[PDB]
């Protein structure tokens, strides 16, 4: 059940340009990243464009906002900063860059940290001193992951860098896990008991390989805050010499299914029939918001636009 | 009297754009400078005295190439946000925007008549299009790659484009066909090209250090000029005619080369920039080399040569 309830372009664009979006603090507005660089609020239920700020000169590809509502993240696709982190109390501005981090997260527990990615090689920095306090790689262990992203445990004691597991603390990596895809490097489930690398779900105390879920793979996945549900997306096949205007153009393919949280079962597949730019739920995961693009190879741009639904 | 070598000193260091200055064109009316950047701007100073004369806006993202209509009233610039756009220099307003490229636009240039408009594009394609009405005159496929510079010939008879495929590759205009493909025993990214001004040569700089000087109707490659660093980025190329036969380019290194044409020993090497200089411009009646480079210098720099 994924009942419509708005549906909104871009304010004053013949081609509109979202790219990705999360939901604020202040509840009804969503923050969305343009194909030009730019930061947008905009009221989902009415699709009334609030604010705008300029933050790089190249589209934004992804985006996070702090929970306690002060910080946001971003990354750019060819720009200097790569990323960048906003300060968005009161006046709007750059707290920090991270120049050449092609992706970057908040820290879980404690959001006092951020972890980009550059290549194979995960950066720790710290959000008020904006210092790197940790660079993780290790030639021996790394698997080379071609759509590598670093990221914390839910308790911030563990990172995962090109599915390798490290130990902040001490800075070591504790085990490597085996390499059975080209791109998709894993992520940590909520319950901190598990990992999920792509179509392999490993447990964490014992390295055993808990699920085999063939339906994850190439996917991004996503959690309702209760850790209940996950939303994977297939990200969008890159080929060879494929056709132009088949050439990127969109990050996911047209569809994103719903897994038990628990035992990774199929609960529904949806196929929105328009390419997926990104998705996201608010903190009482009542709706989920999802950038689709419509349009045409015919198009040389993106035409998306940010659709909410129910959450059944 | 022609110098054994030229005497370029610094006297101008022009400031204002906020992020890498991507290319700087003298008009050729020698009177302004025009500069495109990575902060979507194109600005326009005194070619001179380096006097800020205005900024051009428009543009929603970076710009790589801008390039003076013979007149020196109109100005094409290409952008990442895959357009080109068609200004007039004294109000500044766009008079059209070419949009048909479907990524980023790399290069750009007039036609000597300045009735079209030759660019190239990151989709691998070089397109024409007409100066007046904006609209796509043709649409070649002209390499397997990005393409990263596109220049006509004295007459404009003839395009010459160069792409990341490692071809160069002579085009006739009028007729659209592919009358030469310049290869070379390896075929390392061929990052910028132009005719040389008497249209029977032209230069092409390769990602492998190195710029070369070729026959393009024989294939045969005349000269060579290396001794700076070019492995990355694609840094313009000029023919130096005003003080001395000369080749002049940017380096990885910060620096700018001047090599005798002719001879291919370097003759100067100019120092002052705290980045990659990217792009280069010769005065085309006094000798004056304006230089332009990247994120961490972000200054325009003129040069003079007494000699």
């Known amino acids: 059940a994924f009942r419509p309830i708005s549906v909104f372009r871009e304010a004053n664009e013949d081609e509109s340009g979202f790219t990705c979006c999360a939901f604020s603090a202040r509840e009804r507005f969503l923050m969305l990243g343009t194909c030009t660089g730019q930061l947008k609020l905009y009221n989902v239920f009415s699709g009334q464009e609030e604010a705008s700020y300029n933050c790089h000169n190249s589209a934004i590809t992804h985006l996070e906002p702090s929970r306690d509502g002060s910080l946001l993240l971003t990354s750019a696709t060819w720009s200097q900063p790569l990323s960048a982190l906003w300060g968005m109390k009161s006046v ?43 660079t993780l790689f290790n030639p021996d262990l790394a698997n080379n992951y071609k759509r590598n992203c670093a990221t914390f445990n839910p308790t911030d004691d563990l990172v995962l860098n090109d599915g390798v597991l490290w130990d902040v603390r001490s800075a070591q990596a504790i085990h490597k896990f085996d390499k059975f895809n080209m791109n998709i490097s894993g992520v940590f489930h909520p319950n901190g008991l598990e990992v999920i690398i792509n179509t392999e779900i490993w447990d964490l105390r014992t390295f055993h390989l808990l699920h085999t879920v063939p339906a994850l793979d190439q996917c991004r996945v996503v959690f309702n805050h209760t850790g209940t549900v996950m939303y994977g997306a297939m990200l969008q096949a890159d080929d ?17 299914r719903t897994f038990n949280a628990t035992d990774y079962k199929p609960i529904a597949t949806i196929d929105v029939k328009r390419n997926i730019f990104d998705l996201c739920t608010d903190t009482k995961d009542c709706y989920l918001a999802v950038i689709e693009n419509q349009g045409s190879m015919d198009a040389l741009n993106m035409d998306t636009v940010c659709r909410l639904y129910e959450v059944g | 009297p022609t110098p054994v070598k030229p005497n370029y000193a610094l006297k101008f260091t022009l400031a204002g754009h906020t992020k890498a200055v991507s290319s700087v064109k003298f008009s050729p009316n020698g009177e302004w400078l025009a500069s495109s950047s990575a902060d979507k701007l194109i600005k326009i100073w005194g070619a001179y005295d380096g006097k800020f004369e205005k900024t051009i806006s428009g543009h929603k993202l970076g710009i790589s190439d801008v390039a003076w209509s013979s007149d020196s009233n109109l100005l094409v610039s290409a952008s990442d946000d895959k357009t080109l756009k068609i200004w007039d220099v004294s109000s500044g307003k766009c008079l059209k925007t070419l949009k048909g490229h479907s990524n980023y636009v790399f290069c750009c240039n007039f036609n000597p008549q300045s009735n079209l408009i030759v660019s190239g594009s990151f989709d691998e394609s070089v397109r024409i299009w007409d100066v007046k009405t904006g609209k796509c005159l043709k ?28 071809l160069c590759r002579i085009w006739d205009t009028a007729s659209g066909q592919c009358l030469k493909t310049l290869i070379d025993d390896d075929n390392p990214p061929v990052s910028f090209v132009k005719f040389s001004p008497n249209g029977k040569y032209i230069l092409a700089a390769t990602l492998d250090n190195t710029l070369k000087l070729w026959d393009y109707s024989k294939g045969k490659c005349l000269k060579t000029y290396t001794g700076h660093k070019n492995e990355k980025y694609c840094i313009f190329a000029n023919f130096s005619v005003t003080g001395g036969k000369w080749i002049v380019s940017g380096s990885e290194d910060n620096l700018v080369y001047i090599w005798n044409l002719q001879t291919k020993e370097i003759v100067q090497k100019l ?37």
């Open chain 1, 240 to 256: 060879e010499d494929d056709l132009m205007e088949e050439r990127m153009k969109s990050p996911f393919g047209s569809s994103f």
């Open chain 2, 139 to 166: 649409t070649l496929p002209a390499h397997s790659d990005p393409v990263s510079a596109v220049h006509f010939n004295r007459d404009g008879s003839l395009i010459v484009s160069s792409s990341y495929d490692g």
């Open chain 2, 271 to 307: 120092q002052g920039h705290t980045d990659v200089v990217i792009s280069t411009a010769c005065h085309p009646t006094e000798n004056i080399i304006a230089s332009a480079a990247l994120e961490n210098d972000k200054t325009i720099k003129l040069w003079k040569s007494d000699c």
């Open chain 1, 92 to 134: 709007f501005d750059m707290k920090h860059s991270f120049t050449e981090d092609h992706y970057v997260e908040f820290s879980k527990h404690s959001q006092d940290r951020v972890i980009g990615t550059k290549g194979d090689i995960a950066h720790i920095y710290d959000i008020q001193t904006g210092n790197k306090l940790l």
